[PDB]
Design a protein around this nucleic acid. Structure first.
Length: 1536
RNA sequence: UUGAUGUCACGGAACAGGAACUUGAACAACAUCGUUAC
RNA sequence: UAGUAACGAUGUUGUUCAAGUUCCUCAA
């Protein structure tokens, strides 16, 4: 007796879902069960396990149908078909149940009796209301009834908001679950209708089901009828197996950046030679063990797996791999929800019968990168995320659009709302329009990953970043189009005036929707707007509206979009939107950089930092453009404002901005209110191709390139020819331009920015940024009227340089050295506090210094961007893998000769820090030295005893003595009778050891007058002689000693003076002879067949080292000559090398081995013996500390890394041939000890000695790098206060020098008529410096000498011709020298030095270090150990700065500052200024007719035509060991 | 997997404040091997 | 009965980034 009607809803928007709670907090007292009643619920079976499906109750649909019936019943004057309708009853006497009452002001129609319950025929509204069930509503569930694994498998919980209006930041908040409509678009259920209900109530129910449009926060229409985890573990294992565990976060951040495309792995950077040993992309490979994969190979084999071929799979793989790597690198609340007021009776009111409908279509594109904060969980790498669709599409929710419409409608009026989330509906002017507005969501179909931006915060007391201020941010691209549709229904004749004015504001590109609007986030623009007004008051238009469910679905929308008229309606009352656009145009003159290190790590160029480049969308693809960030420009302008205004004493940079109405808190905003000025990005108006500049860090002592301190950067090029224009804009509020107090502050800040200060970008300390001019327009000269520059009276000329007094006596026929260190003082002061990069102090100076550089000796500043500049034409380009002869050009930027700022900065910094006796800026406090020890018994080789380490590496057992066993000889055989188990020293052997041999003579008393001048014949006694056999050269004898106690057999070779004693020997005569003992320390295996004497059989260890001591050469030495032809080849394995020739051929002295390899090398091998350690003394051992093992590790690292070694691997020692790295349990050791502690361990008899301390502990404690903590503390060296340091910005900025006259090269080019290119000159070897010549020994006597100032001379006239500076022979090219292009004397450059907050004694010393006296000169460039680079600097106008209006050129104040500087120099050091005298002696330039010949010595005296006693004769006598420091300190000591 | 005589939740902008920056001449002369003889 | 003395050859490149901060405030 029922009639089931099957219904089915279909969502067109992401609906919302509530949270599940147990059946105890399901009353009217919970504040989360209420406010969660208008959503869908989540039912889970088997409670306490999150597993179920969502559903929608029937009471919500019943309430919606009742509301739609009330709204539809008054539109036809209360008559459905024929009969009139009763008003209905909405009152209940019981109120302990019915958890929620109605506060709605029920509509009215035809007021009459409420049809009391005691009836027999009701009104159709009574039958629809339900007065066993009359109209039963069923639950809506999913079609197939599935079972999911929780509410986080179908949706995602996002946080909603409630912002304020005056202090427009926030209030409480709440959150809910929302499910997408593309995955769950359908719900099904039924309604059980009785038989005899009516024939007009069914029509009302059908029209009410067709009239309802939204159920759960969304529009609807009701119808009726494993690789990435293991890849992360493998990468982590690779990073842990090596020592590269500090590259993990950079690896995570650079791997996450590869999610844009899979064609980025085949373009990763390489080395500088094109190899595959990058410092982070090629970790894992070694010298051996080929089966070791790198990270590049892992990423290359994972890009094509037939699973990560799509974009989404590769994107997800990269995202979770970066998340896993970040999580591995890591370990190295109040929601005001509800409270609706329980009202007893609703105040029924009538609204009439006039109802219209307006549909506004169109779309809104983006003009700035937008942002919608949706920071979710399970992703902690970005910490500022955007809102995306489950298919990675960008969307804007309708809640943000509704809130922005509310804000704009409150702005159109002048009255904010006063609601408090409860009670009766509010009836203000902006809540009666907001109650008829319906909007929709968007998708934008872009589907691309968003870029990441890095932001910081700078401490305004030191100039660096603050502690703990560094964070990321991701923004959506620019140019994405969203579909738009607004629908309004009311009683007016169309749209109201407020909505028309707001839409006219939005059609002008002033729709600031959401995001970080203070830094120039999303600003949209509504385009292609259409509108059409319907009329639901009649019956021939309402039935056509109800026939097709309105026009909400896609088919109805495609039919409706053919009826809308174009163009928005004009408003009756305009309101002149309250935001004004101001354009900004900056023009530069120097390079520009905006750092981005992750992009430089991914880029294929192979640099360290690259400039910032943003993307923009063209509908489906992204294109990159270089720009300047908006946050950096906002920070620059904010710091320009904050440093001028005082606000009651302390400047705006020291305030906390807690509860103050400061000038920064009313324009730029704070954490309590929003700002009133919004900035934007700045494009570059062109296509600037980046260039690459190489840098280096030159050591102070032994001036050369320091370790691990080579780098480069890729800035955008700028020069005075092409000035790199910048274009941008920013928005200001309307009620700020009308104020006269804030516009003055903005004008002052922009005038201080225009006047040269505040450079934009990165490394401004070397001449980057340097804003040339700034011009704004679009404000009716309200701000651009204080931006006029001014001056003072500029006529006074600069004083001249003083005359010098330090002179030297240089004579002829003498040679000089080029190093001459400068010994410093012992008082480095650190008792002054730094100033602070805040407001401009009163008693300090700021301005510009214009200089003028002029060379007087050829200058070499190379362009290291490309080699082979002097390459011949019309030939092959280049072989892939070879070592050619490098050749460079001069430095050019835009085809213009220039000098960088870092060169001049380093030069002036060296002179200034050697004048004031400050801390050594850069140094190498590691790398302990080592020296080869001499070969002499008494001084060094007496203390080195033979030893052997025990079974554990803790003790060393010493031996008694040693004797040498002959190998590689021809008179024995020791290789084929001994295996490899006893020649490695791991098994003791048994040899026969002889100590003293006995020579023989004939007659002593008749030898006196011609011989016996060697006093060795003092131990002869007597001896009888026999004769048993005959030999060709010797004679056999049996000699007794004194009484016949023993007899020894020998072979005696006679001579001229003992040939008369024997004529014919008859085997039985008794000759007389004398026996003398001689030293003979040998040991054989079995016995020799020449000396049958008593050999003492001993027991000990035997060892070998290999054939060492090769005198290899290339010029057929004295031992290779006079040979017997056909020199053999080198054997491929040892233990078979024998003796070929003898060195002495009269006697049978030292044998050699001459051979020849495939090249022109000729080896001659000594060392026909090995050593044998016997008599191991037990129970006496010495401990090994850690210092000895550190020294041994250093010794092994020096032995194994040598470029001057023998090219053959067979003639090396055991240490270098087998590449050992530790000391084993039993091995060869020559150790040194004293009283149970060992000191030194050397492998061979004559090896090198490593010193105990490092080179940093050989100085004073004050001369070390003045860096560290000892606002900023007061412990800084005097040179790290003018120039910067770490955690302290320096207040001196240099600039690019530019040539103004004609080039005037050294030698003319190959093409006449083109005076812009020079000729090539070839230089000498230029080998690296040796710090082991200034510090000869290692005990305590040799401290670290000074700062290595090169002297001035003229030795470029010998290089220009083609000869050598030392000898006179012509130099020949090789893959070790260069061919540079140089300038000549008589060229002029010009640059500028900007300074700020300097004292009056620091400026005087800076001027004294810039310009020297009238006899000195500076020295910059390449190869200044010859005569190459001698410049002098004259200082022009020094115009100061005293206010933001006038600048007051101070040329007539120099002679005061200089004096004050010297006064300070007298205050610190009283009368101990000898270092300044030496520095003035070392900068002296030859004024005339003086030709000092300086050069480096050769190795010996036989390899130079002058015969000047090269380095091997200078180590004795003049520069022996104790006169080295003394002679190398005096500014001009003869080279001798 | 809801109760019926009463649900404005399309009744609420995840908003407000922050300079990828500080320091650094692309340069530069004396070392490398071990033993032989008495 | 013991351990003493210093000699012989002439050839050759190196660093390519290092030290810092990598999340907080206003709220709760």
């Amino acid at each position: 007796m029922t009639t089931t009607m099957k219904i089915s809803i279909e969502f067109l928007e992401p609906f919302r879902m509530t949270k599940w709670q147990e059946s105890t907090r399901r009353n009217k007292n919970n504040k989360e069960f209420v406010r969660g009643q208008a959503f869908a619920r989540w039912h889970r079976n088997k409670k306490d396990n999150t597993k179920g499906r969502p559903y929608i109750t029937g009471t919500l649909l019943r309430s919606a149908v009742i509301r739609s019936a009330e709204n539809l019943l008054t539109l036809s004057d209360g008559k459905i078909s024929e009969k009139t309708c009763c008003p209905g009853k909405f009152d209940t006497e019981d109120k302990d149940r019915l958890l929620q009452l109605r506060q709605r002001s029920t509509l009215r129609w035809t007021d009459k009796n409420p049809c009391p319950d005691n009836a027999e025929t009701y009104c159709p509204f009574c039958e629809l209301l339900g007065r066993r069930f009359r109209i039963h509503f069923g639950n809506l569930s999913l079609p197939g009834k599935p079972d999911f694994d929780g509410p986080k498998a179908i949706g995602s919980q996002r946080v909603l908001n409630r912002v304020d209006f005056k202090s427009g930041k926030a209030h409480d908040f709440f959150k809910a679950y929302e499910v997408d409509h593309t995955r769950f678009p359908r719900f099904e259920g039924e309604i059980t209708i009785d038989n005899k209900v009516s024939a007009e109530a069914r029509k009302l129910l059908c029209d009410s089901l067709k009239f309802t449009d939204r159920l759960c926060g969304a529009l609807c229409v009701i119808r009726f009828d494993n690789l990435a985890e293991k890849t992360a573990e493998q990468i982590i294992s690779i990073l842990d197996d090596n020592k590269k565990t500090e590259y993990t976060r950079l690896l995570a951040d650079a791997i996450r950046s590869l999610r844009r495309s899979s064609k980025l792995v085949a373009g990763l950077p390489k080395d500088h030679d094109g190899k595959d040993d990058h410092y982070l992309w090629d970790i894992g490979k070694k010298k051996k063990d080929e089966n070791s994969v790198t990270i590049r190979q892992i990423l290359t084999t994972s890009a094509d797996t037939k699973e990560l071929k799509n974009a989404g799979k590769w994107r997800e793989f990269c995202e979770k791999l970066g998340e896993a790597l970040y999580l591995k690198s890591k370990d190295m609340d109040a929601e005001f929800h509800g409270k609706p007021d329980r009202l007893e009776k609703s105040r029924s009111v009538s609204i009439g019968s006039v109802l219209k409908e307006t549909v506004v279509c169109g779309e809104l594109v983006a003009k700035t990168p937008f942002f919608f904060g949706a920071i979710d969980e399970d992703a902690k790498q970005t910490d500022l995320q955007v809102l995306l669709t489950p298919d990675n599409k960008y969307r804007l929710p309708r809640s943000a659009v509704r809130g922005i419409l509310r804000r704009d409608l409150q702005t159109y009026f002048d009255s904010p709302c006063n609601a408090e989330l409860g009670g009766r509906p509010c009836m203000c002017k902006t809540c009666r329009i907001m109650r008829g507005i319906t909007v929709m969501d968007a998708r934008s179909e872009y589907n691309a990953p968003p870029e990441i931006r890095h932001r910081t915060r700078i401490n305004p007391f030191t100039g660096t970043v603050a502690e703990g201020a560094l964070f990321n941010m991701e923004v959506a691209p620019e140019g994405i189009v969203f579909p738009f549709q607004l629908r309004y229904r009311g009683s007016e004749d169309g749209l109201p005036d407020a909505l028309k004015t707001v839409l006219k504001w939005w059609a002008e590109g002033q729709a600031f929707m959401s995001g970080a609007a203070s830094t120039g986030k999303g600003r949209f623009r509504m385009e292609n707007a259409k509108y059409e007004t319907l009329d639901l008051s009649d019956e021939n238009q309402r039935n056509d509206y109800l026939k097709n469910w309105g026009w909400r679905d896609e088919k109805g929308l495609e039919e409706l979009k053919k009826r809308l008229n174009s163009g928005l309606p004009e408003p009756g009352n305009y309101r002149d939107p309250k935001w004004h656009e101001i354009n900004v145009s900056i023009e530069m003159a120097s390079p520009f950089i905006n750092g981005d290190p992750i992009r430089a790590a991914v880029d294929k160029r192979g640099t360290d930092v690259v400039t910032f480049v943003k993307y923009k969308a063209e509908g489906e693809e992204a294109k990159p453009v270089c720009a300047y960030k908006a946050e950096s420009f906002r920070g620059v302008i904010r710091s320009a404002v904050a440093r001028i205004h005082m606000e009651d004493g302390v400047p705006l940079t020291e305030l906390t901005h807690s509860d103050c109405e400061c000038l920064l808190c009313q324009i730029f905003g704070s954490e309590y209110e929003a700002g009133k000025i919004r900035f934007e990005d700045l494009v570059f108006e062109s296509d600037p191709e980046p260039v690459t500049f190489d840098h280096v860090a030159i050591d102070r002592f032994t001036g050369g390139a320091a370790d691990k301190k080579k780098f480069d950067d890729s800035p955008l090029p700028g020069s005075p020819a092409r000035p790199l224009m910048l274009k941008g804009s920013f928005w200001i509020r309307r009620d700020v331009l009308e104020d006269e107090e804030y516009c003055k502050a903005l004008g002052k800040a922009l005038a201080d920015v225009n006047n040269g200060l505040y450079p934009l970008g990165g490394k401004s300390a070397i001449g980057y940024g340097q804003v040339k001019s700034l011009g704004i327009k679009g404000d009716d000269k309200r701000i651009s009227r204080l931006m006029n520059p001014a001056f003072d009276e500029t006529d006074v000329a600069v004083p001249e340089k003083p005359k010098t007094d330090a002179e030297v006596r240089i004579e002829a026929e003498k040679v000089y050295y080029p190093h001459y260190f400068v010994e410093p003082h012992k008082k480095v002061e650190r008792e002054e506090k730094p100033c602070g990069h805040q407001k401009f102090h009163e008693g300090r100076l700021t301005g510009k210094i214009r200089c003028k550089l002029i060379t007087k000796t050829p200058l070499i500043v190379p362009d290291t961007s490309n080699d082979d500049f002097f390459r011949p034409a019309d030939k092959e380009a280049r072989k892939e893998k070879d070592e050619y002869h490098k050749s460079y050009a001069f430095f050019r930027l835009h085809k213009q000769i220039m000098i960088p700022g870092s060169e001049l900065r380093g030069m002036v910094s060296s002179v200034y820090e050697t004048v004031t006796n400050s801390c050594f800026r850069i140094f190498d406090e590691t790398k302990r030295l080592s020296w080869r020890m001499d070969a002499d018994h008494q001084n060094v080789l007496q203390d080195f005893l033979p030893g052997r380490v025990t079974a554990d590496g803790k003790h060393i057992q010493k031996f008694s003595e040693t004797a040498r066993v002959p190998f590689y000889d021809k008179t024995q055989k020791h290789f084929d009778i001994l295996d490899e188990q006893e020649i490695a020293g791991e098994k003791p052997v048994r040899m026969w050891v002889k100590r003293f041999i006995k020579r023989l003579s004939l007659v002593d008393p008749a030898k006196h007058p011609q011989k016996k001048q060697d006093n060795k014949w003092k131990r002869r006694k007597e001896g009888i002689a026999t004769f048993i056999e005959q030999k060709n050269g010797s004679y056999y004898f049996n000699v007794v000693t004194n009484n016949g106690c023993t007899s020894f057999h020998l072979w005696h070779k006679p001579d001229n003076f003992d040939q008369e004693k024997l004529e014919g020997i008859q085997n039985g005569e008794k000759l007389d002879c004398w026996v003398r003992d001689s030293r003979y320390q040998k040991a054989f295996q079995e016995i020799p067949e020449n000396d049958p004497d008593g050999w003492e059989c001993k027991e000990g260890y035997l060892h070998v080292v290999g054939p060492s001591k090769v005198e290899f050469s290339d010029k057929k030495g004295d031992v290779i000559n006079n040979f017997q032809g056909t020199l053999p080849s080198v054997p491929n394995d040892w233990k078979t090398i024998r003796t070929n020739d003898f060195k002495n051929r009269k006697r049978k002295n030292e044998p050699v081995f001459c051979c020849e390899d495939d090249k022109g090398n000729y080896y001659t091998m000594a060392k026909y013996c090995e050593t044998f350690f016997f008599d191991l003394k037990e129970n006496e051992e010495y401990e090994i500390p850690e210092k000895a093992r550190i020294k041994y590790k250093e010794l092994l690292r020096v032995y194994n890394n040598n470029p001057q070694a023998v090219p053959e691997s067979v003639f090396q020692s055991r240490v270098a041939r087998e590449n050992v790295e530790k000391l084993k349990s039993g091995d060869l050791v020559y150790f040194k000890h004293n009283e149970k502690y060992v000191e030194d361990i050397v492998p061979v008899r004559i090896s090198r000695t490593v010193d105990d301390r490092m080179i940093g502990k050989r100085m004073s404690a004050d001369l070390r790098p003045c860096h560290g903590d000892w606002r900023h503390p007061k412990g800084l060296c005097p040179a790290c206060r003018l120039f910067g340091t770490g955690s302290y910005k320096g207040r001196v900025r240099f600039g690019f020098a530019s040539l103004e006259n004609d080039p005037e090269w050294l030698i003319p080019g190959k093409n006449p008529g083109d005076p812009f290119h020079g000729g090539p000159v070839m230089l000498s070897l230029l080998e690296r410096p040796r710090p082991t010549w200034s510090i000869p020994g290692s005990d305590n006597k040799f401290k670290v000498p000074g700062r290595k100032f090169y002297v001035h001379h003229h030795a470029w006239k010998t290089i220009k011709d083609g000869n050598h500076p030392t000898t006179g022979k012509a130099i020949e090219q090789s893959p070790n020298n260069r061919t540079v292009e140089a300038l000549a004397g008589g060229n002029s450059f010009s640059f500028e030095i900007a300074f700020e907050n300097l004292k009056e004694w620091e400026l005087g010393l800076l001027i004294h270090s810039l310009q020297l006296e009238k006899g000195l000169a500076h020295k910059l460039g390449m190869a200044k150990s010859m005569g190459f680079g001698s410049v002098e600097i004259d200082v022009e106008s020094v115009r100061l700065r005293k206010d933001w209006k006038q600048w007051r050129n101070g040329n007539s104040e120099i002679p005061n500052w200089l004096g004050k500087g010297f006064a300070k120099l007298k205050e610190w050091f009283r009368d101990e200024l000898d270092f300044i005298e030496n520095l003035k002696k070392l900068l002296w330039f030859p004024e005339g007719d003086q030709a000092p010949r300086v050069c480096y010595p050769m190795l010996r005296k036989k390899d130079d035509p002058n015969g000047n006693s090269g380095y091997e004769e200078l180590k004795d006598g003049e520069f022996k060991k104790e006169d080295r420091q003394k002679k190398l300190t005096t500014p001009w000591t003869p080279w001798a």
